[PDB]
Amino acid sequence: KVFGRCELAAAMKRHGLDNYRGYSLGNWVCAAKFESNFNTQATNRNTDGSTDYGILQINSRWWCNDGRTPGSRNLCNIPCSALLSSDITASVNCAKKIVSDGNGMNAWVAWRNRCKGTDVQAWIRGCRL
């Protein structure tokens, strides 16, 4: 499933992340354009020996189960590949929590320097709420 602009923006609020745990609507949308290019099928293996699964570029090493990454906490405890299906309905479970970790959104390489401080009100513009 390959998404459009206003095709990825509503279902975020449908799952409850609006201003979630102090994280608002302005901090989300920019990142997947820079981790998956609005794609759900972008699998890439980081030299850390782990791969980045899903549209969030998740490493099998810390949170999921891919079977080729030993010493992985597999903390989410689900198929490291279910994190790939068009139905994201379950993926963010690990999204809403990995933040409770306390070291922030700083779990991703791009938004941090590629998306932070950036005009975000603009990603939520041109669409309907």
Side-chain angles (χ1 to χ4, degrees):
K1 178 169 176 70
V2 187
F3 291 78
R5 173 177 128 153
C6 292
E7 180 171 39
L8 178 64
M12 292 178 110
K13 186 173 196 195
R14 172 180 76 55
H15 190 275
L17 284 178
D18 181 15
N19 289 102
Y20 173 68
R21 198 86 152 170
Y23 293 113
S24 62
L25 178 63
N27 285 293
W28 289 109
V29 35
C30 180
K33 175 69 149 111
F34 296 97
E35 285 286 28
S36 278
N37 186 30
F38 296 127
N39 184 16
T40 312
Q41 288 170 132
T43 309
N44 295 311
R45 178 170 275 213
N46 288 331
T47 45
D48 58 338
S50 69
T51 305
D52 289 339
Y53 297 78
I55 185 165
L56 293 176
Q57 293 284 294
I58 295 159
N59 64 340
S60 35
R61 179 179 293 355
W62 292 116
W63 299 108
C64 65
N65 179 31
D66 58 335
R68 65 180 159 152
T69 310
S72 164
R73 287 169 199 169
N74 182 18
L75 299 176
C76 288
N77 291 293
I78 60 164
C80 188
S81 79
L83 293 165
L84 288 168
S85 178
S86 71
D87 182 27
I88 60 164
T89 299
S91 299
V92 185
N93 284 123
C94 285
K96 290 169 160 187
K97 298 179 295 46
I98 288 168
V99 283
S100 160
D101 186 12
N103 188 310
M105 294 173 56
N106 291 292
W108 288 264
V109 309
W111 180 92
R112 178 164 57 204
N113 278 338
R114 285 190 64 125
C115 288
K116 188 166 195 105
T118 76
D119 182 20
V120 303
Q121 291 79 331
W123 291 107
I124 59 166
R125 186 174 286 106
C127 289
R128 178 171 50 280
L129 291 168

